[PDB]
Structures are given as structure tokens and as C-alpha cells.
């Protein structure tokens, strides 16, 4: 059809290099994390009715899905330009530092507000009480609140991928070998995000710092995830899935 004439049609400068980086981050996110619209949802009925200490049945599924998404986050990291150019030690340090933060961000982009649910990458859809019983425990309300706070930012895959990339590629992590090289990787990621937000939301200028501040909320939440690892270790029979332990050590 016809696109009618608006008013004051936005001008922007050439940002061809950042445009391509933006496209690469978007594809890397999309290809390592399906969207809600491309997932076929299904529920379980296990302990949907009331909060319990831990649904030992839901925890098996949740931890296995968690294992698989950690693998996807390593794949996403390897596709960010330059990440594999860092030493293996720094790659590990960056992933360990940011894994839980990115995983929270990812699962909160799978929030269906009307149903009060979150959807995992195999389609499994749990309501709030089931997310509690699956292992979120006392962090359920904090994670569901974060997911609600994200909705008015109306982030898409590009912004979600760029925010993940920025969270991972962080030169502030303790025990980095080449923290200045990590800082150099991060600078175009901050720029691309800022330019993307300007192009997509020309009528809302404060959106760059507002979206950046979400990282500071993520860290508030994943900081408590450590304490939960220890609580869960005492409730589950046998061992925590080993990749989860490597990321939480």
C-alpha cells in the first residue's frame, strides 16, 4: 500500500560500520535464542496450584533447559566480533561473570504479561508459581518484576542482543588479562546501541541511559542467584548439572 507523508522526516548520518555490527549482533541473538512468536508453547500441570519448597520434577526440566541455554550463550559469545580474539582465560572470565545476567535477560524477554508466564526455548511455559517451584524460590517476584519493567521499553532482538553483548564484553570484570582490549570491544557495542535506539525511537531521547540502567538491575538479581545455588544444592538429590556449576563457581 501507500505510506502517507508524515512531518519532519528524520535525518541520520552514515554509520555503515556500526550498522553491520548491529546486524551481526542481531543475527547472533536470533540464531541462539528463538523468539516467543516462533515457539510452540505447552504447559505442564505440575504444582501449578500453590507454591512449594521445590518441585523436584520441574527442577529437572529447568536445569536441563538451563544447561542448553548456557551452551547457546557460549555460541552467542563466540559470534560477537573479536570475542574469540581474547585469551581463553578472559573469554571464560567474561562468560562466568555475565552468564546469569544474560540468562535472566533472555527469560524475561519470554514473558507473556496477560498469562503471567515465562516460556523456555523448547516452548515450555510456566506461570509464576511454577517458576517459583522450579527453583526461582525467593527470587521469583524479583525476576517477574524485572520482566514487567522491561515491557514499557519495547525492546526488540537487536536491542536485546546488543544489551547482552555489552553485559558480556565488560572490561571491569576482576581477573581479566587484557581488560583494555575488552574495553575496546565494548565501545562500538555501546555506540551501535545508542544509534539504533535513536533511529528506532526518534521521539524518545532518554531511552539509551534508561535501557543501559537495566544492566544495573540485572546485576542486582544475579548477585542473589549465587546464594540460591547454595540453597538448591541442599534440596536436590545428587549433583548440580556440571556446566551450571562451572558458570556459578
Amino acid at each position: 500500500g501507500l505510506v502517507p507523508r508524515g512531518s519532519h522526516m528524520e535525518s541520520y548520518e552514515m554509520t555503515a560500520e556500526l550498522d553491520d555490527l548491529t546486524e551481526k549482533i542481531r543475527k547472533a541473538h536470533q540464531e541462539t535464542f528463538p523468539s516467543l512468536c516462533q515457539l510452540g508453547k505447552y504447559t505442564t500441570n505440575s504444582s501449578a496450584d500453590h507454591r512449594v519448597r521445590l518441585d523436584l520434577g520441574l527442577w529437572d526440566k529447568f536445569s536441563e533447559l538451563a544447561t542448553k541455554c548456557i551452551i547457546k550463550i557460549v555460541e552467542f559469545a563466540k559470534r560477537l566480533p573479536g570475542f574469540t580474539g581474547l585469551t581463553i582465560a578472559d573469554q571464560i572470565t567474561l562468560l562466568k561473570a555475565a552468564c546469569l545476567d544474560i540468562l535472566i535477560l533472555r527469560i524475561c524477554t519470554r514473558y507473556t504479561p496477560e498469562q503471567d508466564t515465562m516460556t523456555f526455548s523448547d516452548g515450555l511455559t510456566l506461570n509464576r508459581t511454577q517458576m517459583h517451584n522450579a527453583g526461582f524460590g525467593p527470587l521469583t517476584d524479583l525476576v517477574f518484576t524485572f520482566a514487567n519493567q522491561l515491557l514499557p521499553l519495547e525492546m526488540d532482538d537487536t536491542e536485546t542482543g546488543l544489551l547482552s553483548a555489552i553485559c558480556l564484553i565488560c572490561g571491569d570484570r576482576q581477573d581479566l588479562e587484557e581488560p583494555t582490549k575488552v574495553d575496546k570491544l565494548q565501545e562500538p557495542l555501546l555506540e551501535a546501541l545508542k544509534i539504533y535506539i535513536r533511529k528506532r525511537r526518534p521521539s524518545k531521547p532518554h531511552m539509551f541511559p534508561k535501557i543501559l540502567m537495566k544492566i544495573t538491575d540485572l546485576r542486582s538479581i544475579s548477585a542473589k542467584g549465587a546464594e540460591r545455588v547454595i540453597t538448591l544444592k541442599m534440596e536436590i538429590p545428587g549433583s548440580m548439572p556440571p556446566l551450571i556449576q562451572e558458570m556459578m563457581e
Binding site: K78, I92, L95, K96, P242, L243, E246, E249
Partner: peptide, 10 residues
């Protein structure tokens, strides 16, 4: 970090 080091060098 046996797993992680393997996934990263893979």
C-alpha cells in the same frame, strides 16, 4: 572449567 574450555576451543 573443563566443559567451558572445551566449548570455547570447539
Amino acid at each position: 572449567h573443563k566443559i567451558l574450555h572445551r566449548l570455547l576451543q570447539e
